[PDB]
């Protein structure tokens, strides 16, 4: 029978994310097989898992991906930072870059450390995490109350650390326009437990490095459009 | 599979541009034609890849590279693409026609008849309004809204079994020119406005033509045009 | 789901020969049965088969559907004409009229003749057909070479004649804008074979009539629109 | 139910290569059978396979499809050219013409040669191919390192030659807007191996001809629109 024309409510429109396909233009084409190329990629998680090196601004424009253990001693932690992907420290890591292109994340964060120093020197280190509170903890005494672990210098050279995923929701804000409970998750710090040993005639100022990677349960959501600032 | 003749000869190409009718008008008359006639040109076009002049079949192709002169100019056409495409002494296929306006926001209709017939002349007068008879007839007439678009497919309509690409015989015993075919065409097309002749306007209108071959076949391969070493 | 609107390439158009139907307007109607009317018609061939009478302009505005055998004798045929439906001779026959409304035809043409004269008179007649050539044949000698037949006056009164269908194509042009091989097919002629007998006191100048009809294989094609000249 | 009108995104458009059909106009037609015509064509490869004759500009506007073996001797090849379909030498061959109407090609190229000279004369010839490099090889010594074959004058009269298909891709550019690796494929040359024999009282300057044809695996792709220059 004739077209039982049922007009559509809002046809004659253009939509960005319309899933369906369109009319083919120059069909009946053949392509060269590409099976010979190895290293296929499936999802960004493959790159997100591989660790990389963070950095910090040089202590009083040169950021540094390493930290050297000082000879001086104080009760304050030697290096600490908030766990917030918007911070500069993650501003070049693969995980941070990938996360910057999503609304929210979900899962744990994995941290790795490495030592680079003399032969006959030994020491002890303490790792800790502190959820958010009135202000960042300062004294090793206060930190000790929070969750912590013992890392010996000599047992191994990389005592891997992972921050557990804790939050009163199902996800968290990838970027923090304004400080909020769901955005920030406290801080993480390292404390020198005891004075290290300085053997005969060995160099001084050992070097320590830190690496970050996404946990096995890491997941992003709600893609967005990028900031084109990097062109400048 | 790209080499297949069918996969090759299944796309639309421009053919010619023509004006829009506004009256009954007189059909062109055969050659040689003397001056003073009322036959008008640039309104009727024949559907044929082979060269044509003044809406009639022809043998030799010409062009008006010299603009100046005196007399009446003529139309010409030839399917450059088809001729350069390949070699085939014989050919047959259904011809598909499509038309699009070349003026701002225009509406019109199109009219066609097959080979062997000829334009129907004369006009009636309704309540003191004159209308050519070509409005109504036995053959299809198409209508489109403003802007305009026309499409349909015509079946094969010539007595000859196939279409000869390069023919060399003659059509009649006396005075027939050698090599000039008879009915290698799908008919004639023309456009007109559904308005009375009494409301004719001076401004001219122009329209293009596009054609497409469907289900093509060929026989007896041949040669290809020469290209200079200049 | 919602209308997956697929716009059509050239909708919103009016076409003369669109085959499909349209919307009913005042359905649920009943009609008076018409089975009581006899003489139903199926195709124009039914009328095309029935013969009719041709005519010729009066020998020096009155066309004549009869011809009378003259007393004078000459080698030229007494009556002949080209086999071309555009000729005036067919311009009122049913077959000619029907053919005038088509692009092309196909099949044989059937011709019939009748005699009307005295009682005790006898004679002989020769029928012939000649395909096209340089010019129409004139002498009975030249005609005799072509296809011919013998019709005796006294054996019967109507020696039916049919022109065979011969052409280098599948059809032929119903009308001839310009003379062409596919359009004209030569001529047909009749020749007086021998002097007829004039018996005592019978009237003179017998009368002969000719009729035309479409052959069993007659067929038309490619309908067209009529010429409205006959209104004037 | 009523038309669940789902408007289409971009209807009311005209597209050149729309594959689907359109509305019939004057259906119910019959055609004359054409089975009586022999020599049916299926694909252009049928014409592409048949060989033809190339040509060269006359040695110091008349191109020549033949070459005559000179009496003088030099280490340089007597006739050579790049294997690039855009070159004038192929500018009239069937293969070249067909290829000019496509984006790219694929497959081998076949070459044939023929001799035309005296009776009691003999000689030797060397055929070679050279991939692209800094510049075309000049000396028969340098050419000999490349792939080559021996063609005796007297064994046969046409020692067929085929250039293997070699390229770092799946196809190659039919036309070369700018010289590129995928476009040009070096050159091919012929060398006179030894002085030919001149017998008593026979004419001099024998004649040799060359023919080209597409290999069995020859294939084109991506049709295009032609250059209409040939009309001028």
Curated annotation (Swiss-Prot), chains A, C, D:
It is found in: Virion; Host cytoplasm. Transmembrane segments: none annotated. Interacts with host entry receptor ANTRX1. Forms an icosahedral capsid of pseudo T=3 symmetry with capsid proteins VP2 and VP3. Together they form an icosahedral capsid composed of 60 copies of each VP1, VP2, and VP3, with a diameter of approximately 270 Angstroms. VP4 lies on the inner surface of the protein shell formed by VP1, VP2 and VP3. All the three latter proteins contain a beta-sheet structure called beta-barrel jelly roll. VP1 is situated at the 12 fivefold axes, whereas VP2 and VP3 are located at the quasi-sixfold axes. Vp3 also seems to be involved in the binding to host receptor ANTXR1 for attachment and uncoating (entry). This is Capsid protein VP3. The chain holds residues 435 to 672 of 2181 of the full protein.
From Swiss-Prot, chain B:
Changing residue 60 to A: 90% loss of viral replication. Residues 60-71 are annotated as: Interaction with host receptor ANTXR1. Coiled coil: none annotated. It is found in: Virion; Host cytoplasm. Disulfide bonds: none annotated. Forms an icosahedral capsid of pseudo T=3 symmetry with capsid proteins VP2 and VP3. Together they form an icosahedral capsid composed of 60 copies of each VP1, VP2, and VP3, with a diameter of approximately 325 Angstroms. VP4 lies on the inner surface of the protein shell formed by VP1, VP2 and VP3. All the three latter proteins contain a beta-sheet structure called beta-barrel jelly roll. VP1 is situated at the 12 fivefold axes, whereas VP2 and VP3 are located at the quasi-sixfold axes. Binds the host receptor ANTXR1 for attachment and uncoating (entry). Interacts with host entry receptor ANTRX1. This is Capsid protein VP1. It comes from Seneca Valley virus (isolate -/United States/SSV-001/2002).
